[PDB]
Amino acid sequence: TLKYICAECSSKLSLSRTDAVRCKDCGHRILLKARTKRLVQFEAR
Amino acid sequence: MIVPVRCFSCGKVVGDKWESYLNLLQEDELDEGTALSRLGLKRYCCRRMILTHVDLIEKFLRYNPLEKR
Amino acid sequence: FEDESAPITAEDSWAVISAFFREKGLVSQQLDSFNQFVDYTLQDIICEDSTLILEQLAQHTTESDNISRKYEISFGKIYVTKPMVNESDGVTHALYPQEARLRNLTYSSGLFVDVKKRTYEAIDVPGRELKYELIAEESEGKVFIGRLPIMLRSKNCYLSEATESDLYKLKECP
Ligand SMILES: [Zn+2]
Ligand SMILES: [Zn+2]
C-alpha cells in the first residue's frame, strides 16, 4: 500500500487505512510520507 | 549554507576555492589576506565572497538523516 | 604581566564579559525565576494554609449520642516529576520537546502531594470543655493534583543536562 518512514528509525512501513498509525519497530507515532515517484522538473535558473 | 559557486558581483568561480582556503588557514598557518591572495582572489568582491562565508552545512549534517538507506 | 598585581587595560574587560556570558547566558533570568518557583515557591504555596478543618458537632437531641467529630485534611511535601505524556491507550511514556511540538502536546510534568487525613473526636459532655482527642483515624499516599508546564532547559527538563551531541541526537538545535 502507501509507504511511510518512521521519524527515528528511517524504516519503511506500508500501511492501509485500517492500520493504527505507529512504527512496528519502536512504536513511534510520527510518520513521514514517502517521496513521490512521478518526475519533478526544475529550472536551473 | 554552503560555499556559493560564483562571486555575486563579477561572476568569478569561487566555489572550488573553499577547501583550499581552509587547508591554507590550517596546514600552512597563513592569515586570511595571504590565503585569499594565494588563491587568486584579487578583487575585493571575491574576497568578501570567500572571507565572510559561514559554512552552516556542517551543522545540518550533524543531525541524523530522515531517510537512511 | 609578570606582576600579578599589574593594572588591567581596556581589552581585559572583554575577558570578564566573556566569563559572565559563559556562566550566565542570555536567557538566565527566565530559567532562574522558573527554577526558584519550582524548587521553593510551590512548596510554600502548598504548605501555607491548605488545612481544611470541618468540625462536625454532635447536634445530639438525646444524651445517648453525645460525641462530636472533626475531620481535617492537610497537604505535605510536593513531588514534581519529569515531563511525561498520557496516551490514548493509557500507556504513559517520557515526552520530549521535539515530540510535543510536532504532536501539539503540552510539555508538562505531573504534580503529586502527600495528603494527610487527620481527625479528632470529643466526648460531648455539656458544661465540661469540649476536649478534642484522637480517634486513631490519623490517616493520609500521593495524589495527582494537576500538571505544571515546564519551560525548556530548566532544571526539571530533559535538556538541562544534555550535551551538544545529545542535543543533536534529540533533534534539538544547540
Ligand atoms: Zn520507529
Ligand atoms: Zn568577484
From Swiss-Prot, chain A:
Keywords for the protein's UniProt record, in alphabetical order: DNA-directed RNA polymerase, Metal-binding, Nucleus, Peroxisome, Ribosome biogenesis, Transcription, Zinc, Zinc-finger
Location in or out of the cell: Nucleus, Nucleolus; Peroxisome
One Gene Ontology term of the molecular function aspect: DNA binding
Source species, domain of life: Eukaryota
GO biological process: nucleolar large rRNA transcription by RNA polymerase I; ribosome biogenesis; RNA-templated transcription; termination of RNA polymerase I transcription; termination of RNA polymerase III transcription; transcription by RNA polymerase I; transcription by RNA polymerase II; transcription by RNA polymerase III
Zinc finger motifs (C4-type), residue ranges: 6-26
Modifications after synthesis and translation: The N-terminus is blocked.
Binding site for Zn(2+): 6, 9, 23, 26
GO cellular component terms attached to this protein's record: cytoplasm; nucleolus; nucleoplasm; nucleus; peroxisome; RNA polymerase I complex; RNA polymerase II, core complex; RNA polymerase III complex
Comment field (misc): Present with 907 molecules/cell in log phase SD medium.
Subunit field text: Component of the RNA polymerase I (Pol I), RNA polymerase II (Pol II) and RNA polymerase III (Pol III) complexes. Component of the RNA polymerase I (Pol I) complex consisting of 14 subunits: RPA135, RPA190, RPC40, RPA14, RPB5, RPO26, RPA43, RPB8, RPA12, RPB10, RPC19, RPC10, RPA49 and RPA34. The complex is composed of a horseshoe-shaped core containing ten subunits (RPA135, RPA190, RPB5, RPO26, RPB8, RPB10, RPC10, RPA12, RPC19 and RPC40) where RPA135 and RPA190 form the DNA-binding cleft.
Family, as annotated: Belongs to the archaeal Rpo12/eukaryotic RPC10 RNA polymerase subunit family.
Identification of the protein by name: DNA-directed RNA polymerases I, II, and III subunit RPABC4
Native source species: Saccharomyces cerevisiae (strain ATCC 204508 / S288c)
Gene: RPC10
Portion of the full sequence shown: 26 to 70 of 70
From Swiss-Prot, chain B:
Classification via SUPFAM superfamilies: RNA polymerase subunit RPB10 (SSF46924)
InterPro entries, per database record: RNA_pol_su_RPB10, RNA_pol_suN_Zn-BS, RPABC5/Rpb10
Record: residues binding Zn(2+): 7, 10, 45-46
Keyword Nucleus part of the UniProt annotation: yes
Keyword Ubl conjugation: yes
A GO cellular component annotation in the UniProt record: RNA polymerase III complex
Covalent cross-link Glycyl lysine isopeptide (Lys-Gly) (interchain with G-Cter in ubiquitin), where: 59
Subcellular location(s) of the protein: Nucleus, Nucleolus
GO MF annotations, alphabetized: DNA binding; DNA-directed RNA polymerase activity; zinc ion binding
Pfam families according to UniProt: RNA_pol_N
Keywords: DNA-directed RNA polymerase, Isopeptide bond, Metal-binding, Nucleus, Ribosome biogenesis, Transcription, Ubl conjugation, Zinc
Bilayer-spanning residue ranges: none
Gene Ontology terms: biological process: nucleolar large rRNA transcription by RNA polymerase I; ribosome biogenesis; RNA-templated transcription; termination of RNA polymerase I transcription; termination of RNA polymerase III transcription; transcription by RNA polymerase I; transcription by RNA polymerase II; transcription by RNA polymerase III
Family per record: Belongs to the archaeal Rpo10/eukaryotic RPB10 RNA polymerase subunit family.
The protein's role, per its UniProt record: DNA-dependent RNA polymerases catalyze the transcription of DNA into RNA using the four ribonucleoside triphosphates as substrates. Common component of RNA polymerases I, II and III which synthesize ribosomal RNA precursors, mRNA precursors and many functional non-coding RNAs, and a small RNAs, such as 5S rRNA and tRNAs, respectively. Pol II is the central component of the basal RNA polymerase II transcription machinery. Pols are composed of mobile elements that move relative to each other. In Pol II, RBP10 is part of the core element with the central large cleft.
PANTHER family named among the record's database cross-references: DNA-DIRECTED RNA POLYMERASES I, II, AND III SUBUNIT RPABC5, DNA-DIRECTED RNA POLYMERASES I, II, AND III SUBUNIT RPABC5 FAMILY MEMBER
Note: Present with 5300 molecules/cell in log phase SD medium.
Full protein name: DNA-directed RNA polymerases I, II, and III subunit RPABC5
Organism listed in the record: Saccharomyces cerevisiae (strain ATCC 204508 / S288c) (Baker's yeast)
Gene responsible for this protein: RPB10
From Swiss-Prot, chain C:
Record's subcellular location: Nucleus
Role summary: DNA-dependent RNA polymerase catalyzes the transcription of DNA into RNA using the four ribonucleoside triphosphates as substrates. Second largest component of RNA polymerases II which synthesizes mRNA precursors and many functional non-coding RNAs. Proposed to contribute to the polymerase catalytic activity and forms the polymerase active center together with the largest subunit. Pol II is the central component of the basal RNA polymerase II transcription machinery.
Subunit structure: Component of the RNA polymerase II (Pol II) complex consisting of 12 subunits.
Note: The binding of ribonucleoside triphosphate to the RNA polymerase II transcribing complex probably involves a two-step mechanism. The initial binding seems to occur at the entry (E) site and involves a magnesium ion coordinated by three conserved aspartate residues of the two largest RNA Pol II subunits.
Assigned protein family: Belongs to the RNA polymerase beta chain family.
Official protein name in the record: DNA-directed RNA polymerase II subunit RPB2
Organism of derivation: Saccharomyces cerevisiae (strain ATCC 204508 / S288c) (Baker's yeast)
Gene responsible for this protein: RPB2
Residues of the full protein shown: 18 to 196 of 1224
